Structure 1
Amino acid sequence: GYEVHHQKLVFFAEXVGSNKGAIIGLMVGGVVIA
């Protein structure tokens, strides 16, 4: 049960080279990294 609302998000990313993971501004749920 998730109730996510009324979000004002600003994401600044600069110089993102060779990214292999997760870069999410707003994430609802689950993140699995192996």
Structure 2
Amino acid sequence: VHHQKLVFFAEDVGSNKGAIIGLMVGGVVIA
């Protein structure tokens, strides 16, 4: 929270392919 960049598919040159599914970092669920 103090400092976060969070950057995806940035500064891409040429042909780029990919995909992101799910992926969870930290956080609290079901308390």
TM-score (norm 1): 0.18
Identity of aligned residues (%): 97
Detail structure 1 runs of 4+ shifted over 6 Å in the superposition: 4-24
TM-score (norm 2): 0.19
Name which structure has the greater RCO, CA cutoff 8 Å, separation 6+. Answer: 1
> What residue number does 2:23 align with?
26
Which 5+ residue runs of structure 2 have no aligned equivalent?
none
Give the structure with the larger strand fraction. Answer: 1
RMSD, matched Cα: 9.1
Which 5+ residue runs of structure 1 have no aligned equivalent?
none
Change (3 A) 1:8 1:22: same
